[PDB]
Design a protein around this ligand. Structure first.
Ligand code: 6OU
Ligand code: 6OU
Ligand code: ASP
Length: 416
């Protein structure tokens, strides 16, 4: 239909990278000239539409793919991949915080800076009592959990419904077996339709990449100056090492080619870089794991679980910025406090939601754990400096958050 058909036949990765580079350059240029408000007014809704189109698909691609994803045997294989993915999700985050501590000791973020105290003293952090957090996994209404966001109760109900369906398909009665296979066929048709709409929105994706990274560079790309450049380098070098020294080694020792893995997962990594949402990149992540031959029983359970639980980049970010704040305050922060940093940033990354900007909010817990409260002005002043470039750090940490889920899914699928 004209120039549109000439634009469609271009390969998706090439125009996604073209939108990435032409968003970064245009955003830096327009942000240096004070045109951040014009970008936020005009350019940003073209990326907001992309995040809306990605979040539209999330619930029918979790529920309908996990009901069909109970095609493996119900106790044995699902319990084995649940344990094998929970051990991976804890160990990679516990290494990610330690790599953040190593990179925050190599660099020195907040190397003796002194700063004024005029920012707002934000919020003393209080956690929910953790029996409500666990008891809210079981939903009191499955349709209410499907309508109110709530990926984590939807995982539980979809696992239960799929196990019940595969018990009904082995029944002696004929009407119950035909009804169960008709329900499974309809749910699988919904899942395949959603995987087609993922390919539909990945053609709009270059405009969304351009309009998202241009807005991010226009607002916050010019504030990366001074020691904020040091903490940005200490975060991004740490994320690069979190990929290369953890994920590539764990892919190599399990017989998976890491370069072919990156060639399969580029469409998920470059989407999570700009959308900054590990729960909005979930349809693209499930499409990537579908394309690389992973069976549905592995990825349909491990990826919506890993969208919230496995956050290695958020863990490394909370490991680095805690050292940044404790260096701006002048604290010694001994190894008995660094082990509590390792213990608390893992729980803070587990508790961090997949929306953009939640890691800076959940940083208050790992701040409060070591004896740096957020209520005093001298800590909140240094914490506002991290909130100045939270989006720049979030762009990389979300990509590492999604790459961790994909690496764990591929490793556990190679284990079976
Ligand atoms: C307001 C919202 C406007 C943006 C809406 C864009 C996408 C929403 C969902 C699109 C329908 C989903 C199903 C369409 C579909 O599957 O075909 C997909 C068709 O792709 C599209 O039509 C997306 C069109 C987005 C246009 C992007 C901006 C156009 C700019 C034109 C350039 C200047 C002229 C591709 O599928 P496939 O790779 O050929 O194979 C699929 C195998 N099943
Ligand atoms: C292994 C761990 C599996 C635990 C799966 C449930 C944990 C995620 C639930 C969740 O997102 O709640 C989050 C809980 O955040 C936290 O307080 C950290 C506690 C993590 C749970 C530790 C394992 C139980 C959201 O809390 P909020 O933002 O204050 O509202
Ligand atoms: N935006 C991050 C979470 C965070 O660190 O705030 C993610 O969803 O992966």
């Amino acid at each position: 239909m004209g120039l549109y058909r000439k634009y469609i036949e271009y390969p998706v990765l090439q125009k996604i990278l073209i939108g990435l580079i032409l968003g970064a350059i245009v955003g830096l240029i327009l942000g240096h000239y004070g045109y951040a408000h014009a970008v936020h007014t005009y350019v940003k809704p073209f990326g907001d539409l992309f995040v809306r189109l990605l979040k539209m698909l999330v619930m029918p691609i979790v529920f309908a793919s996990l009901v069909v994803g109970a095609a493996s045997i119900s106790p044995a294989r699902l319990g084995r991949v649940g344990v094998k993915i929970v051990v991976y999700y804890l160990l990679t985050s516990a290494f990610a915080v330690t790599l953040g501590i190593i990179m925050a000791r190599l660099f020195n973020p907040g190397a003796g800076i002194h700063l004024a105290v005029g920012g707002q003293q934000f919020q003393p952090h209080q956690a929910p009592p953790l029996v409500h957090i666990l008891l809210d996994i079981v939903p009191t209404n499955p349709f209410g959990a499907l309508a109110n966001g709530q990926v984590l109760p939807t995982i539980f109900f979809a696992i239960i419904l799929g196990i019940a369906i595969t018990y009904l398909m082995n029944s002696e009665n004929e009407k119950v077996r035909k009804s169960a296979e008709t329900l499974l066929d309809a749910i699988n048709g919904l899942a395949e339709a959603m995987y087609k709409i993922v390919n539909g929105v990945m053609q709009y994706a270059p405009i969304g990449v351009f309009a998202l990274i241009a807005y991010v560079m226009a607002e916050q790309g010019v504030h990366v100056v001074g020691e904020l450049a040091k903490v940005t380098a200490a975060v991004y070098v740490g994320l690069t090492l979190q990929i290369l020294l953890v994920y590539f080694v764990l892919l190599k020792i399990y017989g998976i080619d890491p370069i072919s893995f990156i060639k399969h997962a580029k469409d998920a990594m470059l989407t999570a870089f700009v959308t900054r949402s590990s729960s909005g990149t979930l349809p693209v992540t499930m499409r990537v794991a579908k394309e690389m031959g992973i069976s549905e029983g592995i990825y349909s359970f491990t990826l919506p679980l890993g969208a919230t639980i496995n956050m290695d980049g958020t863990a490394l970010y909370q490991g680095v910025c805690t050292f940044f704040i404790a260096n701006a305050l002048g604290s010694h922060l001994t190894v008995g406090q660094q082990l509590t940093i390792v213990l608390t940033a893992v729980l803070a990354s587990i508790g961090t939601a997949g929306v953009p900007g939640a890691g800076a909010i959940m940083l208050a817990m790992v701040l409060h754990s070591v004896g740096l409260p957020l209520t005093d002005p001298n800590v909140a002043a240094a914490y506002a400096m991290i909130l100045g470039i939270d989006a720049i750090l979030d762009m990389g940490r979300t990509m590492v958050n999604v790459t961790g889920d994909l690496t764990g899914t591929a490793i556990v699928a190679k284990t079976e």
